[PDB]
Design a protein around this ligand. Sequence first.
Ligand SMILES: CN(C)c1ccc2cc(C(=O)NS(=O)(=O)c3ccccc3-c3ccccc3)oc2c1
Ligand SMILES: CN(C)c1ccc2cc(C(=O)NS(=O)(=O)c3ccccc3-c3ccccc3)oc2c1
Ligand SMILES: [Zn+2]
Ligand SMILES: [Zn+2]
Lengths: 258, 265
Amino acid sequence: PSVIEFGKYEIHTWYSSPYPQEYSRLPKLYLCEFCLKYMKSRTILQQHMKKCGWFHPPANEIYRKNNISVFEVDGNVSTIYCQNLCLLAKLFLDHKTLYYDVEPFLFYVLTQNDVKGCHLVGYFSKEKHSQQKYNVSSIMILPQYQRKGYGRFLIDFSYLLSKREGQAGSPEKPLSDLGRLSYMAYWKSVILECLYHIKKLSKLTGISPQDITSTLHHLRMLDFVIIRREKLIQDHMAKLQLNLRPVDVDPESLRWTP
Amino acid sequence: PSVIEFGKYEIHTWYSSPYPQEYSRLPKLYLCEFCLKYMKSRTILQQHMKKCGWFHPPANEIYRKNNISVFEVDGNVSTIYCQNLCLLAKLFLDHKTLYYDVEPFLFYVLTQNDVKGCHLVGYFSKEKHSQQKYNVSSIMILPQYQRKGYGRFLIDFSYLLSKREGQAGSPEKPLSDLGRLSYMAYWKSVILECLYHQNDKQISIKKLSKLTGISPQDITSTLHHLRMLDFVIIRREKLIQDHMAKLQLNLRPVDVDPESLRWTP
Ligand SMILES: CN(C)c1ccc2cc(C(=O)NS(=O)(=O)c3ccccc3-c3ccccc3)oc2c1
Ligand SMILES: CN(C)c1ccc2cc(C(=O)NS(=O)(=O)c3ccccc3-c3ccccc3)oc2c1
Ligand SMILES: [Zn+2]
Ligand SMILES: [Zn+2]
């Protein structure tokens, strides 16, 4: 599938997804932006939209501040929607673990809300119980919302869940290109802001000891110990004050028990 | 709890509901008309309303015609909202089965829609799988909307679901006073209207129950009350004709349109 219609956006795909044969051989796919069902023609989509009664993901809203929500979706309850989500995601992922056996997985769907509904920005999948302590399986932001802070938001959100349940976590390897950039950029900003104010640091922040030690090495703040480079710490705090991140996870706005 | 603020209505309660102790001993409760959360003060409600972004039940709209919708809410998905709904309902119910273990239940919320949102009129709960074939557990209409046709609408709607999935159904017993009146009045009008459109063509009970979705038991008791039962249906024509005459002039102001239901069983 070369391109998809997803609501009011026409979006050019990055990769191929295993949509069933009779859909896979089509040049364009037509998608409901709310239930994520896939269809063959624009007249079929226009007729689904008239009779479909969803304006949000089919799940419990665990976060809402400003016009930004997170819905906590269970693969064992809303199986078909989560399967549809996995096929949508692969169009913008180099690879992903599974598409169908979604029942042992949770799906945190990020939306941006207006009068017309809760429109899908992106998501991250998570194993209900992961032996390797992975707090993220796959993570994805749709093209139209990229380079605007939603990526950092979701990564920060994934670490808040880990903190709340009192276990340091890590994304499942290997990561996507934009994934690797985001995660490294996140770890940098968090560690620098957290120092202005290792085993102790990992506890406060919820980042795996491995992930922290590699980030310090990249910043040249590692003796063979943490070397405080102040010019780096001060100038980062200056960069945040004179523009600010407009999209920011407020811990007080999370309604969730682990 | 004597009285509740529910949107733009102050409403006097009929019964007590098991709201937790620290709320139960209060003279008034303040309720969000959209998410159904309960609060202690007017200033607390005014501050919830600013940051709550809901103007309808948090679920799939399966019906909308004129300014009337039905939302299909699942106890296993929107657990807390359905729990809040159960506590709201008990304030106007003599009794109800459960309040908390809502996960095996579906909740059909009826709304009347204007520019300010989808405002709650009433609901009926239903077991996802009932061994006794109950198509309604509890049903309730809020006072301000009573005696206006919303009650008959929801009962009619509950039987359309039963028809669609191809099983005759019945409300869980025992029924409330207004429940018993509505249901008996509904069964009468439906059986009489359903007979006018058979010209003469003699119909059986098992065939009638299939067309209408009403339990054979419920039908046989209604015929007995109307004196239209041999030991089979005795068509009293003057009764059938005069009912159709009553509908022709008045018209039923709120009416379930089967073409407007977007739902698979
Ligand atoms: C398609 N796909 C698999 C994926 C996978 C992952 C991502 C991430 C993003 C993203 O847009 N990230 S980001 O919000 O731009 C950001 C990430 C880290 C650090 C900073 C910022 C930032 C902050 C403010 C302004 C601009 C940038 O898109 C993605 C897409
Ligand atoms: C509180 N609770 C458990 C309940 C439970 C059940 C009900 C039912 C009703 C209702 O209002 N039903 S009604 O059909 O609207 C109606 C009731 C009486 C007298 C007349 C009419 C009527 C009929 C047709 C056109 C206009 C008016 O309120 C209810 C409240
Ligand atoms: Zn849809
Ligand atoms: Zn609310």
